[PDB]
């Protein structure tokens, strides 16, 4: 059940979880879809990733207003590329508290991104330091190691079977690992496996550029990344 809302697509994944999808014409690659998440936690809404642009991200907020009609308490963005952070200004214009890996905020200006307002830091084992992610409700934030980028982070949704790999994970039939321009090729495979081990009960793996898949997306992405070293 895809719902077309202007130029964006929304798909319900669970009673309190929806996937948002936006598109950007990349010259040389066609119109590239990017996915994020919208989660209702009681009387508030939590967002994972912006759309590619401010205008598209404002449209996500419009869809939330019409379809959920609860305040958006926070957004967390999963690395400093345009598909995930390109709409930061729209979140700030709306008064929404924003969070990203400290490293994503450090990298944002040179990537042409606007930094989030708050920085997440991570324990040695990858789990977010909880003091830096206050009021995250069911969102469980995990840094799996460098992969698609050095700053990529991932998010599980407690109380569901869903985990979000962002651009780290590709679907079980993907031919390649996509844009490796900022990737850590040596560590990618281990980081993909660490994501899987952090969320062992997640049977629905959501990712940036493909429809949700089974855990075969993780095993396949890791096996593909094995070839990178
Ligand atoms: O420089 C880039 C950056 C991105 C965004 P990201 O996905 O790496 O976060 C990008 C995305 C694409 C692509 C090429 C790309 O080139 O082709 C299919 O999707
Ligand atoms: Zn990226
Ligand atoms: Zn991507």
Question: Which residues have a beta carbon within 5 Å of ligand 2, which is an ion?
Answer: 81, 167
CA distance 41 to 176: 35
Sheet holding 154-157, edge to edge: 139-142, 154-157, 162-164, 204-206
Reported as type and span, the H/E element at residue 58 is helix 54-67
Exp. method: X-ray
List the residue whose alpha carbon is closest to atom 9 of ligand 1.
Answer: 81
Is the separation of the CB atoms in 8 and 66 below 8 Å?
no
Question: CATH code at 216?
Answer: 3.60.15.10
Entry resolution in angstroms?
1.2
- Token pair listed for 78: 């999963």
Residues contributing to the annotated binding site = 79, 81, 83, 148, 167, 170, 179, 209
User: Within 10 A of 112 (CB to CB), how many other CB atoms are there?
Assistant: 11
3-state helix, strand, coil in the chain (%, to 5): 25, 30, 45
- Token pair listed for 219: 């095993």
Could you list the residue range(s) of the whole structural domain that residue 114 is in?
A: 2-227
User: Within 10 A of 13 (CB to CB), how many other CB atoms are there?
Assistant: 18
Q: How many domains does the chain have?
A: 1
Is the CB of residue 181 below 6 angstroms from any atom belonging to ligand 1? Answer: yes
Ligand 1 pocket mutation pick from 170, 179, 180, 184 by most atoms within 8 angstroms of CB: 179
- Token pair listed for 191: 């980081």
CA distance 72 to 64: 8
């Amino acid at each position: 059940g895809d719902q077309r809302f202007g130029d964006l697509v929304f798909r319900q994944l669970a009673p309190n979880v929806w996937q948002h999808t936006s598109y950007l014409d990349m010259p040389g690659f066609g119109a590239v879809a990017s996915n994020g998440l919208i989660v209702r936690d009681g009387g508030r809404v939590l967002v994972v990733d912006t759309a590619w642009t401010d205008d598209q991200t404002a449209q996500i907020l419009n869809w939330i207003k019409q379809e959920i009609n609860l305040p958006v308490a926070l957004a967390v963005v999963t690395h400093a590329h345009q598909d995930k952070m390109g709409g930061m200004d729209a979140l700030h214009a709306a008064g929404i508290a924003t969070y990203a890996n400290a490293l994503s905020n450090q990298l944002a200006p040179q990537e042409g991104m606007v930094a989030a307002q708050h920085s997440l830091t991570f324990a040695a084992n990858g789990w977010v330091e909880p003091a830096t992610a206050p009021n995250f409700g069911p969102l469980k934030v995990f840094y799996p190691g460098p992969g698609h980028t050095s700053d990529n982070i991932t998010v599980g949704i407690d109380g569901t079977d869903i985990a979000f790999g962002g651009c780290l994970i590709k679907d079980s039939k993907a031919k390649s690992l996509g844009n490796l321009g900022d990737a850590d090729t040596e560590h990618y495979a281990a980081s993909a496996r660490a994501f899987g081990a952090a969320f062992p009960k997640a049977s629905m793996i959501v990712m940036s550029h493909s429809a949700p898949d089974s855990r075969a997306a993780i095993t396949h992405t890791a096996r593909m990344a094995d070839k990178l070293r």
